[PDB]
């Protein structure tokens, strides 16, 4: 349920709690703009097919 | 077998007997084969017994294998011990990049500034 | 990377605009 | 100047064999390695190795 | 009266989806021939069955072309195609627009309940150019969006989806904006996507008013089926398992209750033992999504991920008994998904310990970026060829 | 006979092919009268030559003719004295002229002893060759036609070199049925070096292509390699020509063990063949691209096998990839066994057998990323290898080629992975980007540098125009100047 980023260990009983940093947005966004730019390119393809 | 290192190629150099002229000439290759094999084994392991090294490089005697454990430079304890030369000193320095990557950055700038 | 890429797409769309303006200028260059 | 090709043979067809259709599909090379083997692969492995009788 | 609203308040059945789609996929002779199919088709014989797209059903499927049947439906076909055009001709001397519209609509509607795709497409497109009312315009845009689903063409769907959102904003008439979501979601889930499909489907369970497409128990089934794919842990704890419609309808279907609760209770024997039955039962036999391998192959990833995100180390001996299977089965599967970089662990078959690891974060990005990006650079490459030329 | 095909297809299906025949005459009156003449008229061999590019689509529509009933009088309109009209008429089956007359007089026949008459002579005789081979004639009507055309192009001036491009092309094609004469190899050679000193880029490229095709149809790969290197492919060349050259130079780079360059040329090739159609050329460059990526050590994308008509020709390869990607020798032997006969349908089979190196390269680099340590006894069982003896040597080789980064403990019998890098401490991602943005950016200087031309045609339109507007304004500033001396009211 993602409430404290740990890892339980059986056989020794150690509850390891590694610390996790946050997934930086500078990528997630750029995934979204590359994503979007495709759509542009497609529609731009249909504008290409008309003049020539 | 030669291009993608697979061995059992020293064994098939006496089994290609259907044409005898093959077995006369191919003997030459067998001095490069030993070299590539030891070239990989210099990195692939770190402790083997001596008689096994004699069974891998396709030697029959112990003497030959002393000479060839002397050219590569290994020690002769109870098991033939290796020296770490796979990644002896890592590439943990981007100080060596330093100048080169700065050249590259400058280059991008040239393409974004040129008059095209 | 992202920057240069968008830059490229935009410039290219500029080029499409030139080509189409050229075709429609070629229909005028004829006529009378 | 040229504008033609006519130096290579071709194949043209209207009997076309089928695969995964691609429209925006992810087109993974993983899904051509199976054949909807997944129901079969369970049943046969639960009887053969007895992990429907011995093991729950 | 029977549960208040039941089997009413629907759009007309003119494109006659699913019954007339499903009868076609299950009209392939490698899983069913027999009269179970033929019956379905006879219902479509009673609604006049003369369309060269019916001669092209008896042609592609190699069913037998009985000329004695097709000329009675051709006779009926012609009788109402002349009756309707005479309704129209006499309707260009009576009222204006007000009365002409409904003749032209009675025509377009009937060129497609008899299954003639093209004539129908032009009668619809000729009535839409004759605009007047917002609600009607919408209705005949949904007609194209159903018909466009029952021959399953994508261009035909895209332009009408985006032409529908516009007319949905001009009126804001919300209740339509729902059923646009069920269409657009159905389409979103034909082609893979699930993500967006799970948002759409899952956020309108309460306002399912559509028929034609599903019955409603059906619709619920698909919702569960996708939500266990795109949504992650406590996204699904709230949206699904603690919801309203979900629990009530699931309550009368083990085919979803037992497939859902089990993935959540971590009862990984029940989970597989069902997942098979759900692959065959409804994936292969209904027009869900002809990537029936992709949904399972994905599901097994998801699951092995759960029973490996909580344990620094656990041995194959513990999973084999925990999935009900044996060591070989798991060995193959897990090795192939680790080779595909889907799981994020690794195994060693000396001890049979399954150590994990915690890379993730950016390491999965970039990877992803380069993927998408090279796709993009390629489409722009090709484009620059068509432009410079 | 009325009611049958003795009059429905004897005079009414022949009369329609006579309307189309007599329309084709009107078309070559615009290919020759307007355009072949325009070459020398006012452009000295420019855009009116790309209207003779039409020589591609005109053989398909030369079925409107039968080297027609009106032809004897058509080559005789074009000329007064000609020895090609005295070969061409021997090679006609039967001209039986009718009362139609092209726009030539006894005055446009005197005036047609032109340096344009070599262009027409070759241009039409080319048509004679096209049909001569369609009808499955060769021998005398082959050689003679061609060699008279090889005496035509020996002449001077730089415009004939261009049409001689097409000449050479058909020359080789017909020479290639009976038996691809290596005799021509010398002619080509001699005419090639000549073209390098006349600096006829076009002819130079085209010719160089048919030459490379000669060396390649036989096993003279060394001879093409040293050549491709030592020679400079012209800069201006029609794209078709550039696609040929980029398919051949890539073929060569591929055979001499250099998949590196190949996969990058191969691809450029696929993307220069004309878009809408090009069926065969594309259909084959695929059969090679698919294997150069595999050989290189990379999986080909799936879209190459989801394509309209050319999906029926790739079907065997699909099961090569089934085996290569997965990583085991068993399936590779079985699949290259059933379909081996067809792979041997071209000279590709030499490249294929090499993949045995890569199916094991991948099988093993796949085991390294699946596991952390495993015994050699099992490594041999997943790879369908030989012995546990063979395995240890194979893995070892991998290591020394930095393609697995692991280690071996032999006194216990297991290979052990050293994997524990987070890719970002590498430069790798920065090298990958340094690749991306150089490519990308190059597109941005390039497409502005070609966008330059549309603005140029507009600058050809006046950008100092409407001088009478400016002169009217100047005549308003003398009324305005004094309007303000009269609003001041001061002298």
Short mmCIF file of C-alpha atoms in Angstrom, two decimals, chain F residues 45-284:
data_model
loop_
_atom_site.label_atom_id
_atom_site.label_comp_id
_atom_site.label_asym_id
_atom_site.label_seq_id
_atom_site.Cartn_x
_atom_site.Cartn_y
_atom_site.Cartn_z
CA UNK F 45 19.29 20.91 -70.88
CA UNK F 46 17.35 21.63 -67.69
CA UNK F 47 13.76 21.35 -66.54
CA UNK F 48 12.41 20.18 -69.96
CA UNK F 49 14.59 17.12 -69.36
CA UNK F 50 12.69 16.15 -66.18
CA UNK F 51 9.52 16.15 -68.31
CA UNK F 52 11.25 13.33 -70.22
CA UNK F 53 11.50 11.49 -66.92
CA UNK F 54 8.01 10.51 -68.16
CA UNK F 55 9.91 7.79 -70.07
CA UNK F 56 9.16 5.63 -67.01
CA UNK F 57 5.35 5.58 -67.16
CA UNK F 58 5.16 5.52 -70.99
CA UNK F 59 6.09 1.83 -71.52
CA UNK F 60 3.11 0.79 -69.37
CA UNK F 61 0.94 2.99 -71.63
CA UNK F 62 2.80 1.86 -74.77
CA UNK F 63 0.28 -0.98 -74.87
CA UNK F 64 -2.03 1.56 -76.55
CA UNK F 65 0.37 0.89 -79.46
CA UNK F 66 1.62 -2.30 -81.10
CA UNK F 67 4.59 -0.41 -82.37
CA UNK F 68 1.48 0.73 -84.15
CA UNK F 69 -0.11 0.73 -87.59
CA UNK F 70 0.72 4.46 -87.97
CA UNK F 71 4.39 4.19 -86.92
CA UNK F 72 6.16 3.81 -90.27
CA UNK F 73 4.93 7.33 -91.09
CA UNK F 74 5.70 8.67 -87.58
CA UNK F 75 9.48 8.13 -87.41
CA UNK F 76 9.47 9.43 -91.02
CA UNK F 77 7.85 12.70 -89.97
CA UNK F 78 10.68 13.25 -87.43
CA UNK F 79 13.49 13.17 -90.00
CA UNK F 80 14.64 13.61 -93.59
CA UNK F 81 17.80 11.43 -93.77
CA UNK F 82 18.29 8.68 -91.20
CA UNK F 83 19.77 5.19 -91.04
CA UNK F 84 17.86 4.46 -87.82
CA UNK F 85 14.62 4.74 -89.81
CA UNK F 86 16.20 2.10 -92.09
CA UNK F 87 16.86 -0.29 -89.17
CA UNK F 88 13.65 0.53 -87.27
CA UNK F 89 11.45 -0.42 -90.24
CA UNK F 90 13.11 -3.83 -90.67
CA UNK F 91 12.28 -4.46 -86.98
CA UNK F 92 8.61 -3.43 -87.26
CA UNK F 93 6.19 -6.34 -87.62
CA UNK F 94 3.75 -4.58 -89.97
CA UNK F 95 3.07 -0.84 -90.35
CA UNK F 96 -0.08 -0.28 -92.47
CA UNK F 97 -0.55 3.49 -92.42
CA UNK F 98 -3.95 5.23 -92.32
CA UNK F 99 -5.10 8.76 -93.23
CA UNK F 100 -3.77 10.36 -90.01
CA UNK F 101 -0.84 12.81 -90.14
CA UNK F 102 1.24 14.18 -87.26
CA UNK F 103 2.04 17.90 -87.26
CA UNK F 104 4.95 17.71 -89.69
CA UNK F 105 5.14 18.98 -93.27
CA UNK F 106 7.74 18.64 -96.03
CA UNK F 107 9.08 21.79 -94.30
CA UNK F 108 9.18 20.41 -90.73
CA UNK F 109 10.95 17.39 -92.28
CA UNK F 110 13.70 19.48 -93.87
CA UNK F 111 14.12 21.44 -90.61
CA UNK F 112 14.51 18.17 -88.64
CA UNK F 113 18.18 17.42 -89.29
CA UNK F 114 18.75 18.86 -85.78
CA UNK F 115 21.08 18.15 -82.84
CA UNK F 116 17.70 17.33 -81.29
CA UNK F 117 17.41 14.45 -83.82
CA UNK F 118 19.89 12.31 -81.84
CA UNK F 119 17.68 12.82 -78.78
CA UNK F 120 14.56 11.72 -80.69
CA UNK F 121 16.44 8.93 -82.50
CA UNK F 122 17.54 7.39 -79.20
CA UNK F 123 14.32 8.36 -77.38
CA UNK F 124 12.10 6.38 -79.80
CA UNK F 125 14.49 3.52 -80.54
CA UNK F 126 14.47 2.98 -76.76
CA UNK F 127 10.77 2.25 -77.21
CA UNK F 128 11.66 -0.27 -79.94
CA UNK F 129 13.93 -2.06 -77.44
CA UNK F 130 11.28 -2.03 -74.70
CA UNK F 131 8.72 -3.79 -76.89
CA UNK F 132 11.27 -6.01 -78.64
CA UNK F 133 12.07 -7.63 -75.29
CA UNK F 134 8.47 -7.67 -74.01
CA UNK F 135 7.48 -9.78 -77.05
CA UNK F 136 10.40 -12.11 -76.13
CA UNK F 137 12.62 -11.20 -79.05
CA UNK F 138 16.32 -10.64 -78.41
CA UNK F 139 19.37 -11.68 -80.49
CA UNK F 140 19.63 -9.42 -83.55
CA UNK F 141 16.86 -6.93 -82.71
CA UNK F 142 18.42 -6.70 -79.23
CA UNK F 143 22.08 -6.18 -80.03
CA UNK F 144 21.65 -4.10 -83.21
CA UNK F 145 19.17 -1.69 -81.61
CA UNK F 146 21.40 -1.24 -78.58
CA UNK F 147 24.70 -0.86 -80.45
CA UNK F 148 23.26 1.73 -82.82
CA UNK F 149 22.25 3.57 -79.65
CA UNK F 150 25.84 3.17 -78.37
CA UNK F 151 27.05 4.82 -81.58
CA UNK F 152 24.50 7.61 -81.03
CA UNK F 153 25.70 8.55 -77.54
CA UNK F 154 29.36 8.60 -78.68
CA UNK F 155 28.55 12.04 -80.11
CA UNK F 156 29.31 15.34 -78.38
CA UNK F 157 27.54 17.99 -76.28
CA UNK F 158 26.51 17.64 -72.63
CA UNK F 159 22.71 17.30 -72.92
CA UNK F 160 22.75 13.86 -74.59
CA UNK F 161 24.61 12.41 -71.57
CA UNK F 162 21.44 12.75 -69.51
CA UNK F 163 19.16 10.76 -71.86
CA UNK F 164 22.07 8.37 -72.27
CA UNK F 165 21.50 7.62 -68.59
CA UNK F 166 18.21 5.92 -69.52
CA UNK F 167 19.88 4.45 -72.61
CA UNK F 168 22.57 2.65 -70.57
CA UNK F 169 19.95 1.48 -68.09
CA UNK F 170 17.85 -0.42 -70.65
CA UNK F 171 21.03 -1.49 -72.47
CA UNK F 172 22.10 -3.47 -69.42
CA UNK F 173 18.60 -4.72 -68.63
CA UNK F 174 18.17 -6.44 -72.00
CA UNK F 175 21.80 -7.55 -72.06
CA UNK F 176 21.01 -9.25 -68.73
CA UNK F 177 18.41 -11.88 -69.73
CA UNK F 178 20.18 -14.26 -72.15
CA UNK F 179 23.30 -13.96 -69.97
CA UNK F 180 24.52 -10.83 -68.17
CA UNK F 181 27.36 -10.18 -70.60
CA UNK F 182 30.55 -9.31 -68.81
CA UNK F 183 31.69 -7.97 -72.19
CA UNK F 184 29.66 -4.84 -71.46
CA UNK F 185 31.67 -4.42 -68.26
CA UNK F 186 34.42 -2.90 -70.37
CA UNK F 187 32.13 -0.57 -72.34
CA UNK F 188 30.64 0.68 -69.08
CA UNK F 189 34.15 1.13 -67.69
CA UNK F 190 35.32 3.06 -70.74
CA UNK F 191 32.21 5.23 -70.79
CA UNK F 192 32.49 5.80 -67.03
CA UNK F 193 35.98 7.26 -66.89
CA UNK F 194 35.05 9.46 -69.86
CA UNK F 195 32.07 10.76 -67.89
CA UNK F 196 34.35 11.65 -64.97
CA UNK F 197 36.30 14.07 -67.17
CA UNK F 198 33.19 15.52 -68.83
CA UNK F 199 31.89 15.94 -65.24
CA UNK F 200 28.44 14.62 -66.19
CA UNK F 201 27.35 13.79 -62.65
CA UNK F 202 24.08 12.16 -63.80
CA UNK F 203 25.53 9.78 -66.37
CA UNK F 204 28.46 9.17 -64.03
CA UNK F 205 26.22 7.92 -61.22
CA UNK F 206 23.71 5.94 -63.32
CA UNK F 207 26.50 4.23 -65.23
CA UNK F 208 28.42 3.52 -62.03
CA UNK F 209 25.30 1.77 -60.74
CA UNK F 210 24.91 -0.63 -63.64
CA UNK F 211 28.63 -1.34 -63.27
CA UNK F 212 28.31 -2.25 -59.57
CA UNK F 213 25.32 -4.43 -60.46
CA UNK F 214 27.58 -6.24 -62.92
CA UNK F 215 30.24 -7.02 -60.31
CA UNK F 216 27.54 -8.09 -57.85
CA UNK F 217 25.52 -10.45 -60.08
CA UNK F 218 28.72 -12.52 -60.05
CA UNK F 219 31.01 -13.10 -57.06
CA UNK F 220 33.38 -10.17 -57.52
CA UNK F 221 32.95 -8.53 -54.11
CA UNK F 222 36.61 -7.63 -53.55
CA UNK F 223 36.58 -6.01 -57.00
CA UNK F 224 33.57 -3.85 -56.10
CA UNK F 225 34.95 -2.99 -52.66
CA UNK F 226 38.31 -1.57 -53.75
CA UNK F 227 36.31 0.28 -56.43
CA UNK F 228 33.57 1.81 -54.24
CA UNK F 229 36.41 3.08 -52.11
CA UNK F 230 38.71 4.44 -54.82
CA UNK F 231 35.85 6.24 -56.67
CA UNK F 232 33.71 9.30 -55.89
CA UNK F 233 29.95 8.93 -56.38
CA UNK F 234 28.69 12.20 -57.92
CA UNK F 235 27.01 14.82 -55.73
CA UNK F 236 24.01 15.66 -57.92
CA UNK F 237 22.10 12.51 -58.74
CA UNK F 238 18.46 11.58 -59.09
CA UNK F 239 17.32 9.86 -55.93
CA UNK F 240 16.53 6.53 -57.63
CA UNK F 241 20.21 6.43 -58.55
CA UNK F 242 21.22 7.23 -54.96
CA UNK F 243 19.02 4.44 -53.59
CA UNK F 244 20.62 1.91 -55.92
CA UNK F 245 24.10 3.04 -54.87
CA UNK F 246 23.17 2.97 -51.17
CA UNK F 247 21.78 -0.56 -51.46
CA UNK F 248 24.87 -1.86 -53.23
CA UNK F 249 27.55 -0.13 -51.13
CA UNK F 250 25.70 -1.47 -48.09
CA UNK F 251 25.50 -4.98 -49.50
CA UNK F 252 29.29 -4.82 -49.92
CA UNK F 253 29.98 -3.42 -46.45
CA UNK F 254 27.79 -6.23 -45.12
CA UNK F 255 29.62 -9.11 -46.74
CA UNK F 256 33.12 -8.03 -45.61
CA UNK F 257 32.16 -8.22 -41.91
CA UNK F 258 31.30 -4.61 -41.06
CA UNK F 259 27.65 -4.64 -40.05
CA UNK F 260 28.34 -1.25 -38.39
CA UNK F 261 28.27 1.02 -41.45
CA UNK F 262 25.80 -1.25 -43.22
CA UNK F 263 22.87 -0.89 -40.85
CA UNK F 264 23.15 2.90 -41.33
CA UNK F 265 23.42 2.88 -45.13
CA UNK F 266 20.83 0.11 -45.66
CA UNK F 267 18.31 2.24 -43.80
CA UNK F 268 18.99 5.47 -45.70
CA UNK F 269 18.37 3.34 -48.79
CA UNK F 270 14.94 2.09 -47.73
CA UNK F 271 13.94 5.74 -47.11
CA UNK F 272 14.89 7.11 -50.53
CA UNK F 273 13.02 4.67 -52.75
CA UNK F 274 9.87 6.43 -54.03
CA UNK F 275 7.16 6.40 -51.39
CA UNK F 276 3.85 5.32 -52.92
CA UNK F 277 5.37 2.43 -54.90
CA UNK F 278 8.73 0.74 -55.51
CA UNK F 279 7.48 -2.72 -54.69
CA UNK F 280 10.42 -5.01 -55.38
CA UNK F 281 13.33 -2.75 -54.41
CA UNK F 282 11.85 -2.09 -50.97
CA UNK F 283 10.77 -5.75 -50.71
CA UNK F 284 14.41 -6.88 -51.00
#
